[PDB]
Coordinates of C-alpha atoms in Angstrom, one line a residue:
Chain Y
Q1 CA -0.3 21.9 -17.1
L2 CA -2.1 19.3 -14.9
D3 CA -1.9 19.4 -11.1
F4 CA -0.8 15.9 -10.3
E5 CA -2.0 16.0 -6.6
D6 CA -5.6 17.1 -7.5
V7 CA -5.8 14.3 -10.0
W8 CA -4.6 11.8 -7.4
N9 CA -7.0 13.1 -4.8
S10 CA -9.9 13.1 -7.2
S11 CA -9.3 9.5 -8.2
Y12 CA -10.8 8.6 -4.8
Chain W
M1 CA 6.7 12.5 -24.6
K2 CA 5.2 13.7 -27.9
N3 CA 2.4 11.2 -27.4
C4 CA 1.5 13.1 -24.3
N5 CA 1.5 16.5 -26.1
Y6 CA -0.6 16.4 -29.3
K7 CA -2.9 13.6 -30.5
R8 CA -2.9 13.3 -34.3
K9 CA -6.2 14.0 -36.1
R10 CA -8.5 11.0 -36.1
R11 CA -7.9 8.8 -39.1
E12 CA -4.9 10.9 -40.1
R13 CA -2.8 7.8 -40.0
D14 CA -4.4 4.5 -41.0
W15 CA -4.1 1.2 -39.3
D16 CA -0.6 -0.3 -39.6
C17 CA -0.5 -3.9 -40.7
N18 CA 3.2 -3.9 -41.7
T19 CA 5.1 -3.9 -38.4
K20 CA 3.7 -7.1 -36.8
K21 CA 2.3 -9.0 -39.8
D22 CA -0.1 -11.0 -37.7
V23 CA -1.8 -7.9 -36.2
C24 CA -3.1 -4.5 -37.3
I25 CA -2.4 -1.6 -34.9
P26 CA -4.5 1.5 -34.6
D27 CA -2.8 5.0 -34.5
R28 CA -4.5 5.6 -31.1
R29 CA -2.5 2.7 -29.6
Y30 CA 0.8 4.0 -30.9
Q31 CA 0.0 7.4 -29.3
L32 CA -1.1 5.9 -26.0
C33 CA 0.4 8.0 -23.2
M34 CA 2.8 6.0 -21.1
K35 CA 5.4 8.6 -20.2
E36 CA 5.4 7.8 -16.5
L37 CA 5.1 4.1 -16.9
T38 CA 8.2 4.3 -19.1
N39 CA 10.5 6.4 -17.0
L40 CA 10.0 4.3 -13.8
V41 CA 12.8 2.0 -13.1
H42 CA 12.3 -1.7 -2.5
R43 CA 11.5 -5.2 -1.1
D44 CA 7.8 -4.5 -0.2
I45 CA 5.5 -5.7 -3.0
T46 CA 2.4 -3.8 -1.9
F47 CA 4.5 -0.6 -1.9
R48 CA 5.6 -0.9 -5.6
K49 CA 2.1 -1.8 -6.5
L50 CA 1.0 1.5 -5.0
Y51 CA 3.9 3.5 -6.6
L52 CA 2.6 1.9 -9.9
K53 CA -1.0 3.0 -9.4
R54 CA 0.3 6.5 -8.8
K55 CA 2.0 6.8 -12.1
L56 CA -0.8 5.0 -14.0
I57 CA -3.4 7.3 -12.6
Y58 CA -1.5 10.3 -13.8
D59 CA -0.9 8.9 -17.3
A60 CA -4.6 8.0 -17.4
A61 CA -5.6 11.6 -16.6
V62 CA -3.3 12.9 -19.3
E63 CA -4.5 10.4 -21.8
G64 CA -8.1 11.2 -21.0
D65 CA -7.5 15.0 -21.2
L66 CA -5.9 14.6 -24.7
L67 CA -8.8 12.4 -26.0
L68 CA -11.2 15.1 -24.8
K69 CA -9.2 17.7 -26.7
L70 CA -9.0 15.4 -29.8
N71 CA -12.8 15.3 -29.6
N72 CA -12.9 19.1 -29.6
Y73 CA -14.1 19.1 -25.9
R74 CA -17.4 17.5 -26.7
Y75 CA -19.1 14.8 -24.5
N76 CA -20.5 12.3 -26.9
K77 CA -20.5 8.6 -28.1
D78 CA -17.1 9.2 -29.7
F79 CA -15.5 10.5 -26.5
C80 CA -16.8 7.7 -24.3
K81 CA -15.5 5.1 -26.7
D82 CA -12.0 6.4 -27.1
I83 CA -12.0 6.3 -23.3
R84 CA -13.0 2.6 -23.4
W85 CA -10.5 1.7 -26.2
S86 CA -7.6 3.4 -24.3
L87 CA -8.6 2.2 -20.8
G88 CA -8.6 -1.4 -22.2
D89 CA -5.2 -0.9 -23.8
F90 CA -3.8 0.1 -20.4
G91 CA -5.5 -3.0 -18.9
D92 CA -3.8 -5.3 -21.4
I93 CA -0.4 -3.6 -21.0
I94 CA -0.8 -4.1 -17.2
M95 CA -2.0 -7.7 -17.7
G96 CA 0.7 -8.5 -20.2
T97 CA -1.7 -9.4 -23.0
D98 CA -1.0 -6.5 -25.3
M99 CA -0.3 -7.2 -29.0
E100 CA 1.8 -4.1 -29.9
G101 CA 5.0 -4.5 -27.9
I102 CA 7.0 -1.9 -29.8
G103 CA 9.8 0.3 -28.7
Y104 CA 9.0 1.9 -25.3
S105 CA 6.3 -0.7 -24.8
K106 CA 9.0 -3.4 -24.3
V107 CA 10.5 -1.2 -21.6
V108 CA 7.1 -0.8 -19.8
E109 CA 6.9 -4.5 -19.8
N110 CA 10.4 -4.9 -18.3
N111 CA 9.4 -2.5 -15.5
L112 CA 6.3 -4.5 -14.9
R113 CA 8.3 -7.8 -14.7
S114 CA 10.5 -5.9 -12.2
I115 CA 7.4 -5.2 -10.0
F116 CA 5.3 -8.3 -10.3
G117 CA 8.1 -10.8 -10.9
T118 CA 8.3 -13.5 -13.5
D119 CA 7.0 -16.6 -11.6
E120 CA 4.2 -18.8 -12.8
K121 CA 1.2 -17.1 -11.1
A122 CA 2.7 -13.6 -11.5
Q123 CA 0.3 -13.2 -14.4
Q124 CA -2.6 -14.0 -12.2
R125 CA -1.5 -11.3 -9.7
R126 CA -1.3 -8.7 -12.5
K127 CA -4.9 -9.6 -13.5
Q128 CA -6.3 -9.2 -10.0
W129 CA -4.4 -6.0 -9.4
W130 CA -6.0 -4.4 -12.5
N131 CA -9.4 -5.8 -11.7
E132 CA -9.1 -4.0 -8.4
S133 CA -7.7 -0.7 -9.7
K134 CA -9.4 -0.2 -13.0
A135 CA -12.5 1.8 -11.8
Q136 CA -10.1 4.3 -10.3
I137 CA -8.0 4.4 -13.5
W138 CA -11.2 5.1 -15.5
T139 CA -12.1 7.8 -13.0
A140 CA -8.6 9.3 -13.5
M141 CA -9.2 9.4 -17.2
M142 CA -12.4 11.3 -16.5
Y143 CA -10.5 14.0 -14.6
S144 CA -11.0 16.8 -17.1
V145 CA -14.7 16.0 -17.2
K146 CA -15.1 15.5 -13.4
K147 CA -13.2 18.8 -13.0
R148 CA -16.2 20.6 -14.5
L149 CA -19.4 18.6 -14.0
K150 CA -18.4 17.8 -10.5
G151 CA -20.1 14.5 -9.7
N152 CA -22.5 14.3 -12.7
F153 CA -19.6 13.0 -14.7
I154 CA -20.9 9.4 -14.2
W155 CA -24.0 10.2 -16.3
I156 CA -21.9 11.0 -19.3
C157 CA -20.1 7.6 -19.8
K158 CA -21.2 4.3 -18.4
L159 CA -18.8 2.8 -15.9
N160 CA -20.0 -0.8 -15.9
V161 CA -19.3 -0.9 -19.7
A162 CA -15.8 0.6 -19.6
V163 CA -14.5 -1.6 -16.8
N164 CA -15.8 -4.8 -18.5
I165 CA -12.9 -7.0 -19.5
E166 CA -12.6 -7.9 -23.1
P167 CA -9.8 -9.4 -25.2
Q168 CA -7.8 -6.7 -27.0
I169 CA -8.6 -7.9 -30.5
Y170 CA -12.3 -7.7 -29.6
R171 CA -12.1 -4.0 -28.8
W172 CA -9.9 -3.2 -31.8
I173 CA -12.4 -4.7 -34.2
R174 CA -15.1 -2.5 -32.8
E175 CA -12.9 0.6 -33.2
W176 CA -12.0 -0.5 -36.7
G177 CA -15.6 -1.1 -37.7
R178 CA -16.4 2.3 -36.4
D179 CA -13.6 3.9 -38.5
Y180 CA -14.7 1.9 -41.6
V181 CA -18.3 3.3 -41.6
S182 CA -16.9 6.8 -41.2
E183 CA -14.6 6.5 -44.2
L184 CA -16.8 4.5 -46.6
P185 CA -19.3 7.3 -47.2
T186 CA -16.6 9.9 -48.0
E187 CA -14.7 7.5 -50.3
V188 CA -17.8 6.5 -52.2
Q189 CA -18.8 10.2 -52.5
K190 CA -15.4 11.1 -54.1
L191 CA -16.0 8.3 -56.6
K192 CA -19.5 9.4 -57.7
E193 CA -18.6 13.0 -58.2
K194 CA -16.1 12.0 -61.0
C195 CA -17.3 8.7 -62.2
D196 CA -21.1 8.8 -62.2
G197 CA -22.8 8.0 -65.6
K198 CA -21.5 7.3 -69.1
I199 CA -19.1 9.1 -71.3
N200 CA -21.3 8.3 -74.4
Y201 CA -24.5 6.5 -75.2
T202 CA -23.0 3.2 -74.2
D203 CA -19.6 3.5 -72.4
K204 CA -19.1 4.2 -68.7
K205 CA -16.9 7.2 -67.9
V206 CA -14.2 5.0 -66.3
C207 CA -13.6 3.7 -69.9
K208 CA -12.1 6.9 -71.1
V209 CA -12.4 9.8 -68.6
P210 CA -9.0 10.1 -66.8
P211 CA -10.2 12.0 -63.7
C212 CA -12.6 9.0 -63.0
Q213 CA -9.8 6.5 -63.6
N214 CA -7.7 8.4 -61.2
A215 CA -10.6 8.3 -58.7
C216 CA -11.1 4.5 -59.2
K217 CA -7.4 3.8 -58.6
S218 CA -7.6 5.8 -55.4
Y219 CA -10.6 3.9 -54.2
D220 CA -9.0 0.6 -55.1
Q221 CA -6.1 1.5 -53.0
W222 CA -8.3 2.5 -50.1
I223 CA -10.6 -0.5 -50.2
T224 CA -7.6 -2.8 -50.6
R225 CA -6.2 -1.6 -47.3
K226 CA -9.5 -2.2 -45.6
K227 CA -9.7 -5.7 -47.1
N228 CA -6.2 -6.5 -45.8
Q229 CA -6.9 -4.9 -42.4
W230 CA -10.1 -6.9 -41.9
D231 CA -8.4 -10.1 -43.0
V232 CA -5.7 -9.7 -40.4
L233 CA -8.0 -8.6 -37.5
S234 CA -10.6 -11.2 -38.0
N235 CA -8.1 -14.1 -38.3
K236 CA -6.4 -12.8 -35.2
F237 CA -9.8 -13.0 -33.5
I238 CA -10.3 -16.6 -34.4
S239 CA -6.7 -17.4 -33.4
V240 CA -7.1 -15.8 -30.0
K241 CA -10.6 -17.3 -29.7
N242 CA -9.0 -20.8 -30.0
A243 CA -6.4 -20.4 -27.3
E244 CA -8.4 -19.3 -24.3
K245 CA -11.7 -19.9 -22.4
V246 CA -13.2 -17.8 -25.1
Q247 CA -16.8 -17.8 -23.7
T248 CA -18.3 -14.4 -24.5
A249 CA -21.8 -13.0 -24.2
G250 CA -23.2 -13.6 -27.7
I251 CA -19.9 -13.4 -29.6
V252 CA -19.1 -16.4 -31.8
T253 CA -17.7 -14.9 -35.0
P254 CA -15.8 -11.6 -35.6
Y255 CA -18.9 -10.4 -37.5
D256 CA -21.0 -10.6 -34.4
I257 CA -18.8 -7.9 -33.0
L258 CA -19.6 -5.6 -35.9
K259 CA -23.3 -6.5 -35.5
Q260 CA -23.2 -5.2 -31.9
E261 CA -21.2 -2.0 -32.6
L262 CA -22.9 -0.9 -35.9
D263 CA -26.4 -0.1 -36.9
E264 CA -28.3 -2.4 -39.3
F265 CA -25.0 -4.2 -40.0
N266 CA -25.1 -6.4 -43.1
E267 CA -22.2 -8.7 -43.5
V268 CA -23.1 -9.8 -47.0
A269 CA -23.0 -6.2 -48.1
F270 CA -19.8 -5.6 -46.1
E271 CA -18.0 -8.4 -47.8
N272 CA -19.3 -7.2 -51.1
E273 CA -17.7 -3.8 -50.5
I274 CA -14.3 -4.9 -49.3
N275 CA -14.1 -7.4 -52.2
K276 CA -15.0 -4.8 -54.8
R277 CA -18.2 -6.5 -56.0
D278 CA -20.8 -4.2 -54.4
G279 CA -23.4 -2.5 -56.7
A280 CA -21.8 0.9 -56.4
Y281 CA -18.3 -0.2 -57.3
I282 CA -19.3 -2.3 -60.3
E283 CA -21.5 0.5 -61.7
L284 CA -18.8 3.1 -61.4
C285 CA -15.4 1.4 -61.8
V286 CA -16.0 -1.6 -64.0
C287 CA -16.0 -0.9 -67.8
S288 CA -18.0 -4.1 -68.4
Chain J
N1 CA 17.3 8.5 20.7
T2 CA 18.3 5.8 18.1
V3 CA 16.5 3.6 15.7
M4 CA 18.9 1.1 14.0
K5 CA 21.1 0.4 17.0
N6 CA 18.2 -0.8 19.2
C7 CA 17.1 -3.2 16.4
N8 CA 20.4 -5.0 16.5
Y9 CA 20.8 -5.7 20.2
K10 CA 19.6 -4.8 23.7
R11 CA 21.6 -3.6 26.7
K12 CA 21.8 -5.8 29.7
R13 CA 18.7 -5.7 32.0
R14 CA 19.0 -2.9 34.5
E15 CA 22.2 -1.7 32.9
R16 CA 20.6 1.8 32.7
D17 CA 18.2 2.7 35.5
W18 CA 14.9 4.4 34.8
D19 CA 15.0 8.0 33.6
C20 CA 13.2 10.8 35.5
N21 CA 15.2 13.8 34.1
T22 CA 14.2 13.9 30.5
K23 CA 10.5 14.3 31.3
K24 CA 10.0 15.5 34.8
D25 CA 6.4 14.1 35.2
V26 CA 7.3 10.5 34.1
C27 CA 10.0 7.8 34.4
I28 CA 10.9 6.0 31.3
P29 CA 12.3 2.4 31.3
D30 CA 15.3 1.6 29.2
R31 CA 13.4 -1.1 27.4
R32 CA 11.0 1.6 26.0
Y33 CA 14.0 3.7 24.7
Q34 CA 15.3 0.5 23.0
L35 CA 11.9 -0.3 21.5
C36 CA 12.5 -1.3 17.9
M37 CA 10.7 1.1 15.4
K38 CA 13.2 1.1 12.6
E39 CA 10.8 0.2 9.8
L40 CA 8.0 2.3 11.4
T41 CA 10.3 5.3 11.4
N42 CA 11.1 5.0 7.6
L43 CA 7.4 4.5 7.0
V44 CA 7.1 7.8 5.2
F45 CA 0.0 11.3 -0.6
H46 CA -0.6 7.5 -0.5
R47 CA -3.3 7.4 2.2
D48 CA -4.9 4.4 0.4
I49 CA -6.8 1.7 2.2
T50 CA -4.0 -0.8 1.5
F51 CA -1.5 1.7 3.0
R52 CA -2.9 1.4 6.5
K53 CA -4.4 -2.1 6.2
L54 CA -1.4 -3.9 4.6
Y55 CA 1.7 -1.7 4.2
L56 CA 1.5 -0.3 7.7
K57 CA 0.6 -3.7 9.1
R58 CA 3.5 -5.4 7.4
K59 CA 6.1 -3.0 8.6
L60 CA 4.8 -3.2 12.2
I61 CA 4.6 -7.0 12.0
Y62 CA 8.2 -7.2 10.9
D63 CA 9.1 -4.7 13.7
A64 CA 7.4 -6.9 16.2
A65 CA 9.3 -10.0 15.2
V66 CA 12.6 -8.3 15.5
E67 CA 11.7 -6.9 18.9
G68 CA 10.6 -10.4 20.1
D69 CA 13.7 -12.0 18.8
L70 CA 15.9 -9.6 20.6
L71 CA 13.9 -10.0 23.8
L72 CA 14.5 -13.7 23.5
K73 CA 18.3 -13.2 23.2
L74 CA 18.2 -10.6 26.0
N75 CA 16.7 -13.4 28.1
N76 CA 19.5 -15.8 27.1
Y77 CA 17.1 -17.7 24.9
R78 CA 15.1 -18.8 28.0
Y79 CA 11.4 -19.3 27.3
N80 CA 10.0 -18.3 30.7
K81 CA 7.9 -15.9 32.8
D82 CA 10.4 -13.0 32.3
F83 CA 10.4 -13.4 28.5
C84 CA 6.6 -13.4 28.5
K85 CA 6.4 -10.2 30.5
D86 CA 8.9 -8.4 28.2
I87 CA 6.8 -9.5 25.2
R88 CA 3.8 -8.1 27.1
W89 CA 5.5 -4.8 28.0
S90 CA 6.8 -4.1 24.5
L91 CA 3.5 -5.2 22.9
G92 CA 1.7 -2.7 25.1
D93 CA 4.0 0.2 24.1
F94 CA 3.5 -0.6 20.4
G95 CA -0.2 -0.4 21.2
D96 CA 0.1 3.0 22.9
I97 CA 2.2 4.3 20.1
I98 CA -0.3 3.2 17.5
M99 CA -3.2 4.6 19.6
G100 CA -1.2 7.8 20.2
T101 CA -1.3 7.5 24.0
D102 CA 2.5 6.8 24.5
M103 CA 4.2 8.8 27.3
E104 CA 7.7 8.8 25.9
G105 CA 7.5 11.1 22.8
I106 CA 11.2 11.6 22.3
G107 CA 13.3 11.8 19.2
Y108 CA 12.2 9.4 16.4
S109 CA 9.0 8.8 18.4
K110 CA 7.9 12.2 17.2
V111 CA 8.7 11.2 13.7
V112 CA 6.6 8.1 14.0
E113 CA 3.7 10.0 15.6
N114 CA 3.7 12.3 12.6
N115 CA 3.8 9.4 10.1
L116 CA 0.6 8.1 11.9
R117 CA -1.1 11.5 11.7
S118 CA -0.7 11.6 7.9
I119 CA -1.9 8.0 7.5
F120 CA -5.0 8.0 9.8
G121 CA -5.7 11.8 9.7
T122 CA -6.0 14.4 12.4
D123 CA -9.7 14.9 12.5
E124 CA -11.9 14.3 15.6
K125 CA -12.6 10.5 15.1
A126 CA -9.1 9.8 13.8
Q127 CA -8.2 8.8 17.4
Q128 CA -11.0 6.2 17.5
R129 CA -10.1 4.8 14.2
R130 CA -6.5 4.2 15.3
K131 CA -8.0 2.4 18.4
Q132 CA -10.0 0.0 16.2
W133 CA -7.1 -0.6 13.9
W134 CA -4.9 -1.8 16.8
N135 CA -7.8 -3.7 18.4
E136 CA -8.3 -5.7 15.2
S137 CA -4.6 -6.2 14.7
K138 CA -2.9 -6.7 18.1
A139 CA -3.5 -10.5 18.0
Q140 CA -1.4 -10.7 14.8
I141 CA 1.3 -8.4 16.2
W142 CA 1.7 -10.6 19.3
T143 CA 2.1 -13.6 17.0
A144 CA 4.9 -11.9 15.1
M145 CA 6.8 -11.3 18.3
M146 CA 6.7 -15.0 19.0
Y147 CA 8.0 -15.9 15.6
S148 CA 11.4 -16.9 17.0
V149 CA 9.9 -19.2 19.6
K150 CA 7.2 -20.4 17.2
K151 CA 10.1 -21.2 14.8
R152 CA 11.1 -23.9 17.3
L153 CA 7.7 -25.2 18.4
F154 CA 4.2 -21.5 21.1
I155 CA 0.8 -20.2 22.1
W156 CA 0.9 -22.0 25.5
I157 CA 3.4 -20.9 28.1
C158 CA 2.8 -17.3 26.9
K159 CA -0.9 -16.4 27.1
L160 CA -2.6 -14.3 24.4
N161 CA -5.5 -12.9 26.4
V162 CA -3.2 -11.5 29.1
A163 CA -1.1 -9.6 26.6
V164 CA -3.7 -8.2 24.3
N165 CA -5.8 -6.8 27.2
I166 CA -5.6 -3.0 26.9
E167 CA -4.2 -1.2 29.9
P168 CA -3.1 2.4 30.5
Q169 CA 0.7 2.6 29.8
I170 CA 1.4 3.9 33.3
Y171 CA -0.2 0.7 34.7
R172 CA 2.2 -1.5 32.8
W173 CA 5.2 0.6 33.6
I174 CA 4.5 0.4 37.3
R175 CA 4.4 -3.4 37.1
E176 CA 7.7 -3.4 35.3
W177 CA 9.3 -1.0 37.8
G178 CA 8.1 -3.2 40.7
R179 CA 9.7 -6.3 39.1
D180 CA 13.0 -4.4 38.7
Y181 CA 12.8 -3.0 42.3
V182 CA 12.5 -6.4 44.0
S183 CA 15.4 -7.8 41.8
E184 CA 17.7 -5.0 43.0
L185 CA 16.7 -4.8 46.7
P186 CA 18.4 -8.1 47.8
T187 CA 21.6 -7.2 46.0
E188 CA 21.8 -3.8 47.5
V189 CA 21.0 -5.0 51.0
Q190 CA 23.6 -7.7 50.6
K191 CA 26.3 -5.2 49.8
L192 CA 25.3 -3.4 53.0
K193 CA 25.3 -6.4 55.4
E194 CA 28.7 -7.5 54.2
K195 CA 30.3 -4.3 55.3
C196 CA 28.1 -2.9 58.1
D197 CA 26.6 -5.8 59.9
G198 CA 27.3 -5.8 63.6
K199 CA 29.3 -3.6 65.9
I200 CA 32.9 -2.3 65.7
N201 CA 33.0 -2.4 69.5
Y202 CA 30.8 -3.5 72.4
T203 CA 28.2 -0.7 72.1
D204 CA 28.9 1.1 68.8
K205 CA 27.7 0.0 65.4
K206 CA 30.2 -0.1 62.5
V207 CA 28.5 2.8 60.8
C208 CA 29.7 5.0 63.7
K209 CA 33.4 4.7 63.1
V210 CA 34.1 2.3 60.2
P211 CA 34.5 4.3 57.0
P212 CA 34.2 1.5 54.4
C213 CA 30.8 0.8 56.0
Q214 CA 29.9 4.5 56.0
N215 CA 30.7 4.7 52.3
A216 CA 28.6 1.6 51.7
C217 CA 25.6 3.3 53.4
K218 CA 26.2 6.3 51.3
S219 CA 25.9 4.2 48.1
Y220 CA 22.8 2.6 49.5
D221 CA 21.3 6.0 50.2
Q222 CA 21.9 6.9 46.5
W223 CA 20.2 3.8 45.2
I224 CA 17.2 4.0 47.5
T225 CA 16.9 7.7 46.8
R226 CA 16.6 7.1 43.1
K227 CA 14.0 4.4 43.8
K228 CA 12.2 6.8 46.0
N229 CA 12.0 9.5 43.3
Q230 CA 11.0 7.0 40.6
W231 CA 8.1 5.7 42.6
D232 CA 6.9 9.1 43.5
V233 CA 6.9 10.2 39.9
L234 CA 5.2 7.0 38.7
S235 CA 2.6 6.8 41.5
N236 CA 1.5 10.4 41.0
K237 CA 1.4 10.0 37.3
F238 CA -0.9 7.1 38.0
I239 CA -3.3 9.3 39.9
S240 CA -3.0 12.0 37.4
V241 CA -3.9 9.8 34.4
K242 CA -6.7 8.0 36.4
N243 CA -8.4 11.3 37.3
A244 CA -8.6 12.1 33.5
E245 CA -10.7 9.1 32.4
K246 CA -14.0 7.3 32.9
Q247 CA -12.2 2.9 34.7
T248 CA -9.9 0.0 35.4
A249 CA -11.6 -2.4 37.9
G250 CA -9.5 -4.1 40.6
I251 CA -7.2 -1.1 40.7
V252 CA -7.9 2.0 42.9
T253 CA -4.5 3.0 44.2
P254 CA -1.1 2.6 42.5
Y255 CA -0.2 0.1 45.3
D256 CA -3.0 -2.3 44.1
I257 CA -0.8 -2.8 41.0
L258 CA 2.2 -3.8 43.0
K259 CA 0.0 -6.3 44.9
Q260 CA -1.1 -7.8 41.6
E261 CA 2.5 -8.1 40.4
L262 CA 4.5 -9.2 43.4
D263 CA 4.0 -12.0 45.9
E264 CA 3.3 -11.2 49.6
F265 CA 3.6 -7.5 48.8
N266 CA 3.5 -5.4 52.0
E267 CA 2.7 -1.7 51.2
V268 CA 3.7 -0.7 54.7
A269 CA 7.1 -2.4 54.4
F270 CA 7.6 -1.0 50.9
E271 CA 7.1 2.5 52.1
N272 CA 9.4 2.0 55.0
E273 CA 12.2 0.8 52.7
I274 CA 12.0 3.6 50.1
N275 CA 11.8 6.0 53.1
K276 CA 14.8 4.5 54.9
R277 CA 12.9 3.6 58.1
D278 CA 12.8 -0.2 57.8
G279 CA 14.3 -2.5 60.4
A280 CA 17.3 -3.5 58.2
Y281 CA 18.4 0.1 57.3
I282 CA 17.9 1.3 60.8
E283 CA 20.0 -1.5 62.2
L284 CA 22.8 -1.2 59.6
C285 CA 23.0 2.5 58.7
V286 CA 21.6 4.4 61.7
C287 CA 24.2 5.0 64.4
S288 CA 21.8 5.8 67.3
Chain N
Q1 CA 18.8 -12.6 9.4
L2 CA 15.0 -13.0 9.6
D3 CA 13.0 -14.3 6.6
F4 CA 10.6 -11.3 6.1
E5 CA 8.2 -13.4 4.1
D6 CA 8.2 -16.4 6.5
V7 CA 7.4 -14.0 9.3
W8 CA 4.6 -12.4 7.4
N9 CA 3.2 -15.7 6.4
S10 CA 3.6 -17.2 9.9
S11 CA 1.6 -14.3 11.4
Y12 CA -1.5 -15.8 9.9

């Protein structure tokens, strides 16, 4: 239930 | 997998000092989400390093999300610290200085040896990597928060504190001291309710009243686990503090840790409690 | 085109003539087709700083070394002028590929160009960034190409400044084409003289009644006709590209390039040859 | 047949 890509993009 | 589903209630399971006899493990560590780190495993080193950060960042966001939920979605001292405790554990696991090494943890380490190698300075390279990636890992843990406060998230928890490197035992002692002061009041309250006062003009209730005796036995068991936990943790602290550079900002004894993390800490009273010779205990549970 | 094949070996020089049929507005040299891009093709959402600063750089550096090694073998392991020019030509094309100003754009070159759009981005200034990346990397890429020679000794007979100087791709291709032209000319004229030189009788040249000679002249016509077409395509491409910029000093007309590449270059004689009105061709292949 | 690491190291 967690969008992997948005997490990755947000990490920067 | 289950570790990445539901975090057990805080203090539902107590610290485990039976698996590795020389160390005491917190339930939080046992539940540390490392699903992706586990299920992983070309030539290029820098490539695998990046494939690693990708999986770590995702595990961090899940871990952080679950800690937020465990805290009932409240931004407070308790949330920011669980983030610290768990961020650090990731750091140690990455740097190969973790004290757990159980089950799937052994696998995670094999996969890390498969990425950084096993040569002499391989350990140094694992340290620099982490020291370069951590701030992003922390940010990844703050995903659920950043998802909602959009930029102001950095005013909730302090970054410079979370990323600061500290030996694992150091952080665990803080967490433990924090748990201890949470439990103590409750346990002492249980005791008073049933054991306060005398049964006659001269004898304490504990002398004859069974409900009180039951309470005293329960307390004994509780305080005995604390006593054993502290002994193990504080001796591990000295051990680790005798096998490294061990130069820390104002930390000489394991008590100095508690003095930093707790308010008006008083070690003489603390030792009185864990050794069942504090005023409250004598008054309530000692027939003479 | 291919990718792995041309990273194992190169075809003999001038084995395949330039190609004007694939793209009508440009002639492509075989060397360009055989340009090694294996690693750069399998390059690839991981758009990290390290991805373009290290990973990308590493795969290109390795690509450069393989290219340089094969060019050395192509030159029969001779470390001379010809080897240095090949290194320069291939270095330049790598440069145009990175900077996205390559004129080939066929097969796997389209794949690479996409891989670079994902890495650097496709915004307005993405082009400039790719330019700076190359400018601050080309020196290292050149060194990688010399690895094979450097592995024996290297910075001397082959000059860095000459190679790293940026130049429109069409400029470099014209120089390369001129070198190939003057290598072929003597051979082709030789074939001609050895069949057509002189007269069959007192007043009539051999080309008038001697078939073997007539067939020789036919073959020459074909060669010179290809050369003619190739120069026309290249020289007009030069003017076309020059009109669309703001420029290279020392060079005004496409001939100025030939003057800078060849010794005692006569533009008038050159035009006579490719247009079959030079003294030699008239005497050997024109009956009256 | 080329030492990838020696090439990378040599390029500096």
